Write a protein that holds these residues in place. Structure first.
Motif, PDB file in Angstrom:
ATOM      1  N   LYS A  47      42.678  25.868  64.938  1.00 58.01           N
ATOM      2  CA  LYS A  47      42.741  26.701  63.372  1.00 58.01           C
ATOM      3  C   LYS A  47      41.957  28.052  63.752  1.00 58.01           C
ATOM      4  O   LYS A  47      41.867  28.199  64.931  1.00 58.01           O
ATOM      5  CB  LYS A  47      41.031  25.298  62.713  1.00 58.01           C
ATOM      6  N   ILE A  79      40.580  31.979  62.717  1.00 56.63           N
ATOM      7  CA  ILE A  79      39.490  31.940  61.356  1.00 56.63           C
ATOM      8  C   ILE A  79      39.758  33.941  61.438  1.00 56.63           C
ATOM      9  O   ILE A  79      39.980  34.576  62.691  1.00 56.63           O
ATOM     10  CB  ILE A  79      38.361  32.116  62.112  1.00 56.63           C
ATOM     11  N   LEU A  90      37.231  37.007  60.659  1.00 53.56           N
ATOM     12  CA  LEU A  90      36.185  38.070  60.208  1.00 53.56           C
ATOM     13  C   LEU A  90      36.388  39.036  59.907  1.00 53.56           C
ATOM     14  O   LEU A  90      36.757  39.870  59.469  1.00 53.56           O
ATOM     15  CB  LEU A  90      35.468  37.849  61.593  1.00 53.56           C
ATOM     16  N   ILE A 110      43.947  28.842  58.272  1.00 60.98           N
ATOM     17  CA  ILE A 110      43.463  29.861  58.583  1.00 60.98           C
ATOM     18  C   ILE A 110      42.124  29.574  57.756  1.00 60.98           C
ATOM     19  O   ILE A 110      41.853  29.905  56.098  1.00 60.98           O
ATOM     20  CB  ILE A 110      43.995  31.015  58.347  1.00 60.98           C
ATOM     21  N   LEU A 111      41.640  30.178  58.056  1.00 61.25           N
ATOM     22  CA  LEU A 111      39.536  31.001  57.240  1.00 61.25           C
ATOM     23  C   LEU A 111      39.599  31.861  56.668  1.00 61.25           C
ATOM     24  O   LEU A 111      39.103  32.774  58.109  1.00 61.25           O
ATOM     25  CB  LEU A 111      38.424  30.063  58.158  1.00 61.25           C
ATOM     26  N   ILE A 150      37.206  34.754  56.165  1.00 61.13           N
ATOM     27  CA  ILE A 150      35.230  35.828  55.671  1.00 61.13           C
ATOM     28  C   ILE A 150      35.621  36.741  55.368  1.00 61.13           C
ATOM     29  O   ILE A 150      35.734  37.366  55.794  1.00 61.13           O
ATOM     30  CB  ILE A 150      34.949  34.879  56.823  1.00 61.13           C
ATOM     31  N   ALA A 171      30.701  33.606  62.699  1.00 63.21           N
ATOM     32  CA  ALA A 171      31.922  32.935  62.376  1.00 63.21           C
ATOM     33  C   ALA A 171      31.546  31.534  62.489  1.00 63.21           C
ATOM     34  O   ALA A 171      32.395  30.725  61.141  1.00 63.21           O
ATOM     35  CB  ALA A 171      32.571  34.037  62.553  1.00 63.21           C
ATOM     36  N   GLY A 216      31.977  28.711  59.055  1.00 59.45           N
ATOM     37  CA  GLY A 216      33.436  28.273  59.415  1.00 59.45           C
ATOM     38  C   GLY A 216      32.999  26.483  60.215  1.00 59.45           C
ATOM     39  O   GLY A 216      34.051  26.165  60.825  1.00 59.45           O
ATOM     40  N   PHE A 247      35.057  23.844  58.598  1.00 53.80           N
ATOM     41  CA  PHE A 247      36.493  24.156  58.347  1.00 53.80           C
ATOM     42  C   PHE A 247      36.945  23.454  59.986  1.00 53.80           C
ATOM     43  O   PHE A 247      38.063  23.315  59.428  1.00 53.80           O
ATOM     44  CB  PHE A 247      36.544  25.911  58.466  1.00 53.80           C
ATOM     45  N   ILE A 248      36.465  23.597  61.013  1.00 50.72           N
ATOM     46  CA  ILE A 248      37.027  23.350  62.558  1.00 50.72           C
ATOM     47  C   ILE A 248      36.891  22.417  62.290  1.00 50.72           C
ATOM     48  O   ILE A 248      38.019  21.670  63.478  1.00 50.72           O
ATOM     49  CB  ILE A 248      36.112  24.257  63.167  1.00 50.72           C
ATOM     50  N   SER A 268      40.717  26.508  67.446  1.00 51.20           N
ATOM     51  CA  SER A 268      40.087  26.926  66.773  1.00 51.20           C
ATOM     52  C   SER A 268      40.235  28.439  67.295  1.00 51.20           C
ATOM     53  O   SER A 268      40.147  28.768  68.695  1.00 51.20           O
ATOM     54  CB  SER A 268      38.550  27.157  66.669  1.00 51.20           C
ATOM     55  N   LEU A 270      39.406  33.549  66.348  1.00 47.30           N
ATOM     56  CA  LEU A 270      38.881  33.970  66.043  1.00 47.30           C
ATOM     57  C   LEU A 270      39.738  35.097  66.150  1.00 47.30           C
ATOM     58  O   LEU A 270      39.483  35.792  66.774  1.00 47.30           O
ATOM     59  CB  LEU A 270      37.513  34.251  66.033  1.00 47.30           C
TER      60      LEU A 270
END
Ligand SMILES: Cc1cn([C@H]2C[C@H](O)[C@@H](COP(=O)(O)OP(=O)(O)OP(=O)(O)O)O2)c(=O)[nH]c1=O
Ligand SMILES: Cc1cn([C@H]2C[C@H](O)[C@@H](COP(=O)(O)OP(=O)(O)OP(=O)(O)O)O2)c(=O)[nH]c1=O
Ligand SMILES: Cc1cn([C@H]2C[C@H](O)[C@@H](COP(=O)(O)OP(=O)(O)OP(=O)(O)O)O2)c(=O)[nH]c1=O
Ligand SMILES: Cc1cn([C@H]2C[C@H](O)[C@@H](COP(=O)(O)OP(=O)(O)OP(=O)(O)O)O2)c(=O)[nH]c1=O
Ligand SMILES: Cc1cn([C@H]2C[C@H](O)[C@@H](COP(=O)(O)OP(=O)(O)OP(=O)(O)O)O2)c(=O)[nH]c1=O
Ligand SMILES: Cc1cn([C@H]2C[C@H](O)[C@@H](COP(=O)(O)OP(=O)(O)OP(=O)(O)O)O2)c(=O)[nH]c1=O
Ligand SMILES: Cc1cn([C@H]2C[C@H](O)[C@@H](COP(=O)(O)OP(=O)(O)OP(=O)(O)O)O2)c(=O)[nH]c1=O
Ligand SMILES: Cc1cn([C@H]2C[C@H](O)[C@@H](COP(=O)(O)OP(=O)(O)OP(=O)(O)O)O2)c(=O)[nH]c1=O
Lengths: 292, 292, 292, 292
Positions: free
Chosen positions: C3, C5, C7, C50-51, C53, C90, C94, C97-98, C103, C105
Motif C-alpha cells: 500500500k 502513501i 505525504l 494509495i492514501l 495526506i 504519515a 496512516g 489504512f496500512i 507499505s 511512502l
C-alpha cells in the motif's frame, strides 16, 4: 578492437550567425565544448583511439583544444572533410584510419545521457559482426533517418527525412560497424539530396539481415544541438543535472580516471592549470571522494 | 564626434573549460555572437567608428567575423591587448585610435536591454565634457565597482570589488569620456589587484567634480555573461524576447538600416547569403514591414 | 500487495507567497499538477491502493482533483494531517489504512526520472522484509537525511540536516517498509527540530541491520520542488524531455493503460473531455501508436 | 480617479490538466501568484480601488489570497462571472462597481515589464476621455486583437483573431476607458465566436475617432501565461531579473510602500509573518535601503 570516429564538421547554417564565429562543435553546452559530449560517449563505449573529422578551417582548432589525447589516455587523430557531403563520407575519409578494425561513428552535435547508458554501449561494442544503431522516440521524426517496426517489433525499413514518416522512431547519431562498412560506403551514390547518406549504409546492412536496431528508451536523454532553441535547452538540461548532483556530465578527465586510462597522479596534474576555476576544483575533488 | 572601444579580451577563466576552444566574446548569446550585443550598444549611441580590442590569438577571429565594418556602415579597427592587465589599458592601447575625440568604452561581455535605452545613451553621448557612467542595482555589488550615494542622491565615492560594499549600485560596463581620459589613464599605477582600474579613472573625474552618474533603473536589463549560469540566463532572456516579439535584439544590420547607415539595397544584399536560415529571413522581412 | 502513501501537506513557506493560498503539491511542474509525479512513481512500483495526506484545507482539493482513482484503475483514499509535525506522522495517520500490509511512502514534492527507473522500483517493492531507501549524490546534502558509507560501501550512519554532512549522499523521498514501520513510528519522540523524523525510522531499521540502501546513480534525475528556483528548473527539465520525445512524463492515464489497469475504451473515454487540448490529444494518440 | 478591473476567470483549457486543480491566475510565475502581476500594473497606474472577477469556484480563493486590500492600502472587491462569455462582460458585471468613474481593465494572465512603464501607464490613466490601448509587435498576431496602421501610423482597423492578420501589432490586455464603455458594452451582441468581445468595444471608440492606440515598444516585455511553454518562459524571465538585481518584480507591498499608500510601520508589519522566507526578508530590507 574498435576504433571511433567523430564527425565534427558541417556548415552550421541553422545556427547562423552564431557559427560563422566558430564551428558548432566548439560552442559550449553549458560548461564545456560541445565536442566533449560525443567524445565522452565513445570513451564510455571503451574506445580509446579516435579520429576527429572537421572542416579545413576548424580542424586545427580541435587539435589545439584536444591535442593528441595522451593527457587523457586517448590516441586522437585528425582529418579534414573538404565539404559536408554526407555522414557516410566519414568512412571514406576515415578509411586508412580504420584499417581492418571494428568501428564506431558519432556525430559531433549529439549528446547522450542516461542510467546504464554505458551498459547499452557495451552491448553494442561487443557484437563483432554486422552493425548496430539505436532508435529513439521523438516529436519530429521527419528531421532524421526514421525506422519502421513491424508488429513483432522488428525493424523493417529505413528512410531519411521522409515527408511522411512511418513511425516516430529516429535512428540516433551513434553507429557501430564491422569490417563491411568501408566497402559499403565506397559503393554509395549521392542521394537526391546530394549526400552520401549514412542511412543508405544502414539500409545495406538491413537488406542483409545484419542490422541490429536497439531501442533507446524514453528514459534516456538524446538531445541535438542543431537549432538555437535546442542548443539552449540542452544547456539548461546539463546545468540542472550538474547543479543538483555536484557531478559533472561528460568530463573526459573524470571518465579517463574512472576507466583507469590515467592514474591519480595524472589527474592531479590535469587539475592544477585549471585549479582557479570550478572545473579544476571538481577534478581535484574526485581524487578524495568515492562516487558510486 | 565620439569614438568607441569594445574591450573584448580577457583570459575568461570562470568559464573554463568552455572558453579554452575560444574567447568568451565569440560565444553565442542565444542566437548571435556575444560581441554583437555591445557592438549594437555603441551603434545605438550613434557611434560608427570603433576599436575592437582582444587577445592576440582572438584578434584575427574577430576580424574574420566583423571585417572592417563597411558592410554595416561602420568603420571597425582592431588592436591587441598582450595581457589582461586592466580595463583602463583600453585607453593606452586605444590612444592613437582616439586622437583628440570624445570616446566611449563598452565591455565585450556586457549586455543591455530596455525601453528608451537609446535615449539614455544619447543623453550621455552628448555631454561634451567630463565623464558619464551608469549605476544599476544588483544582488552582488561586491563583484563590481560600487558607487555610494549621499541622501541627496549624489555620488560620493567609488570602490572596486569591496569586501563591504557601501551600497547595492554597481557601475556598469559602459563608459563615456571626454579628452582627459587618455592622460588620466597614462598616470595610473596598478592597483593591489595588479590592474590598471577603470574605477581609478572614474574616481579621477569624481575628485574633480566632473563624473556624472546616472541611474539605470530596475526597468532596464543589465546582464553579464560572466559565469556559466549567467550566460545561460542571458540566452534564455533573449530567446524569450525574440520569440514573443518576432523582433531580434542587437542585430547590427537592422540597427544600421534603421539609423540610415546603410540603405535598403545594402540590407537586401546582406540578407541573401543568410537567406536559408531564420536570420536572413528576418533581415528580408524588415524591408517590407514598418516597425515602430 | 503493498500500500502506498503520498505525504502532500506541509506549509511550503519556502514558496511563499506562491503557496499562501494553495498547497505546493497542486502547482504545476510544466504541464501537470505536481502530485501527478509521485503518484506516477507509486503507480510504476505497481501500487494501486494509495492514501493521500494533506492539510485540512487542501485535502478536499486533492479529492476534487483525483477523486477515488477508479477512473485510472486506482483506489485513492484521503486523510488530513492537522499540523506538519514530521514525515513519520504519515505512519500514524496512516496506520489503519496500512493494516498489516507492506507499505511505501513518497513525498509529494519529489520528482524522479530515469531509464530503468521502473525496474529499480520493482526490486524494492518486492522485498518482503526490512526497509528500502535510495541514496543520491547531491550538491547540498545538508538539506536532507544524509547517509554515510564505510569503504566497503556499506551504510553505517544516518543524520538529518547535519551542519557537517559526512557524505554527499542524500536519502531521497521514497521509502519502502515492511510491517515494523507503524510500531517504530509509534515510539518516536520529537526531535530537537520538533519533528517525528523518518530519519529516525530509518535508523531504527539500520540499527537492526534491516535497512537496505541502494544507490540511485547519477544517471537518474532526482529533483525537489522545494524552492522557487528548483521548481522552475524542474519545469524546464520536464518540458525539454517532453518536447524532444513527444512523450509525456508522469501522465497517470498512460501508465494506467500501460499497466493494463484500464483498457483502451476507458482511456478513450478519459481523453474525450480533454480532447480540445494537447493533453487529451496525447492520450488519444497513445491508442494508435506502439511505444516501446 | 479611475477604478480598475482584473478579469481573472476563464477556464484555461489550453493549460489542462494543470489548471484543473487551480485557476490559472493563482499559479505562480516564478515566485508569486500570477495575479500579483496585473494587480501591480493597476497599482502603478495609480489605481487603488479594484474589482476582481473570477469563476464562481475560484473567487473565494482570490478573496483568501488578497483579502479586502486594506493591508496594502487598496480597496479590493470581488464578483463572479458565471461563465467565460467574453472580456467585455467585465463591463456588465462591473457596471455598478464602476458607477460614473473612469475605468481600467487588465487581464489576469498578462504580465508587463519595462523601464518607464509607469510613465506609460500614467499618461493613459490621465486622459479623461476616450479609450486608450497599446499595440505590441508579436510573432503570432493571429492569436489576439490585431490593429492595422496606415502609412501615417494611424490606427484604422481592428480584428479579433484573424486568420490573416493585417499587421503584427497585437492590442494587449490592458485597457483604459472613459464613461462611455458601459453603454457600449450593453449594446454588444455575441460574435460568431460567441463572445462579447472587447475588440468590439474598442472598435466602437475607433469609429468615433476616440480610440487612442499607443505603441508599446520592443523595449518592454509583454508576456502572456496562456500556454505551458509561455508560462515557463515568463517564470524564467522574472527569475533572471530578480536574481540579477536583488529587486523583486510586482511585489504589491513594495509598490504600496513606494506610493505611500502604506507607511514604514505597516510594511514592517506585513513582513513579520513572512520573515522566515526570502519574500519577507526582502520586504524588510526595503525599510533600510534606498532604491532609486
Ligand atoms: C552532413 C555532415 C554533418 N557533419 C556533422 C555535423 C553535425 O555535427 C552533424 C550533423 O550535421 P547536421 O545536423 O546535418 O547539420 P549541419 O551541421 O550540416 O548544418 P545545418 O544545421 O546547416 O544543416 O554531423 C559532418 O561532420 N559532416 C557532414 O558532411
Ligand atoms: C580585464 C580585461 C577584461 N577584458 C574584458 C573581458 C571581459 O569581457 C570583460 C570583463 O573581464 P572580467 O570578466 O573582469 O574577467 P575575464 O574577462 O578575464 O574573465 P575571468 O575573470 O573569468 O577570467 O572585459 C578585456 O578584454 N581585457 C582586460 O584586461
Ligand atoms: C517601482 C517598481 C517598478 N516595478 C516595475 C515596474 C516597471 O515595469 C518596471 C520599471 O519601473 P519604472 O519606474 O517604470 O521604470 P524604472 O524604475 O526603470 O525607471 P527610473 O528608475 O528611471 O525611474 O519595474 C516593479 O515591479 N516594482 C516596483 O516597485
Ligand atoms: C513536514 C511535512 C511535510 N510534508 C510534505 C511536504 C512536502 O512535500 C514534503 C517535504 O516538506 P518539506 O520539503 O520539508 O517542506 P515543507 O512543505 O515542510 O514547507 P517548507 O518549505 O516551508 O519547509 O513533505 C507533509 O506532507 N507533512 C509534513 O508534516
Ligand atoms: C512507461 C512510463 C515511464 N515513465 C517514466 C518512468 C521512468 O522514470 C521513465 C522511464 O521508464 P522506464 O520503464 O523506467 O525505463 P524505459 O522506459 O527507458 O525502459 P525500457 O528500456 O524498457 O523501454 O519514464 C513515465 O513517466 N510514463 C510512462 O508511461
Ligand atoms: C561514470 C560517468 C557517467 N557519465 C554519464 C554517463 C551516463 O550516461 C550517465 C550515467 O552513468 P552510468 O554509470 O552510465 O549509470 P549510473 O552511474 O547511474 O549507474 P550506477 O550509478 O548504478 O553505476 O552519466 C558521465 O558523464 N561521466 C562519468 O564519469
Ligand atoms: C474569456 C475570459 C477570460 N478571462 C480571463 C482569463 C484569462 O486570463 C484572460 C484571457 O483568457 P484567454 O487567454 O482568452 O483564454 P482562457 O483563459 O479561457 O484559457 P483557454 O483559452 O486556454 O481556455 O481573460 C476571464 O476572466 N473571463 C473571460 O470570460
Ligand atoms: C531599434 C532597435 C533597438 N534595439 C534594442 C535597443 C533597445 O535596448 C531596445 C529598445 O529600443 P528603443 O527604441 O530604445 O526602445 P523602444 O523601441 O521601446 O522605444 P520606442 O518604441 O518608444 O521608440 O531594443 C535593438 O535591439 N534593435 C533595434 O533595431
Amino acid at each position: 578492437k574498435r576504433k571511433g570516429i567523430i564527425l565534427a564538421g558541417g556548415s552550421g547554417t541553422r545556427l547562423h550567425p552564431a557559427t560563422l564565429a566558430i564551428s558548432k562543435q566548439l560552442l559550449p553546452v553549458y560548461d564545456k565544448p560541445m565536442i566533449y559530449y560525443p567524445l565522452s560517449t565513445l570513451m564510455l563505449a571503451g574506445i580509446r583511439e579516435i579520429l576527429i573529422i572537421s572542416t579545413p578551417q576548424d580542424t586545427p582548432r580541435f587539435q589545439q583544444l584536444l591535442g593528441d589525447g595522451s593527457n587523457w589516455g586517448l590516441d586522437l587523430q585528425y582529418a579534414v572533410q573538404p565539404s559536408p557531403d554526407g555522414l557516410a563520407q566519414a568512412f571514406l575519409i576515415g578509411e586508412s584510419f580504420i584499417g581492418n578494425d571494428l568501428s564506431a561513428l558519432v556525430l559531433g552535435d549529439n549528446l547522450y545521457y542516461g542510467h546504464d547508458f554505458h551498459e547499452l554501449l557495451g552491448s553494442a561494442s561487443q557484437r563483432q559482426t554486422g552493425a548496430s544503431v539505436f532508435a529513439y522516440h521523438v516529436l519530429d521524426p521527419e528531421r532524421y533517418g526514421v525506422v519502421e517496426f513491424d508488429q513483432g517489433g522488428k525493424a523493417i525499413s529505413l528512410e531519411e527525412k521522409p515527408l511522411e514518416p512511418k513511425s516516430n522512431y529516429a535512428v540516433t547519431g551513434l553507429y557501430f560497424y564491422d569490417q563491411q562498412v568501408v566497402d559499403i560506403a565506397r559503393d554509395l551514390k549521392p542521394s537526391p539530396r546530394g549526400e552520401l547518406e549514412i542511412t543508405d549504409v544502414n539500409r545495406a546492412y538491413l537488406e542483409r539481415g545484419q542490422l541490429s536496431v536497439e531501442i533507446m528508451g524514453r528514459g534516456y536523454a538524446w538531445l541535438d544541438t542543431g537549432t538555437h532553441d535546442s542548443l539552449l535547452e540542452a544547456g539548461q538540461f546539463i546545468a540542472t543535472l550538474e547543479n543538483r548532483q555536484g557531478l559533472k556530465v561528460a568530463c573526459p578527465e573524470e571518465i579517463a580516471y574512472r576507466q583507469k586510462w590515467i592514474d591519480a597522479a595524472q589527474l592531479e596534474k590535469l587539475a592544477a592549470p585549471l585549479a582557479k576555476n570550478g572545473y579544476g576544483q571538481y577534478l581535484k575533488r574526485l581524487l578524495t571522494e568515492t562516487v558510486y
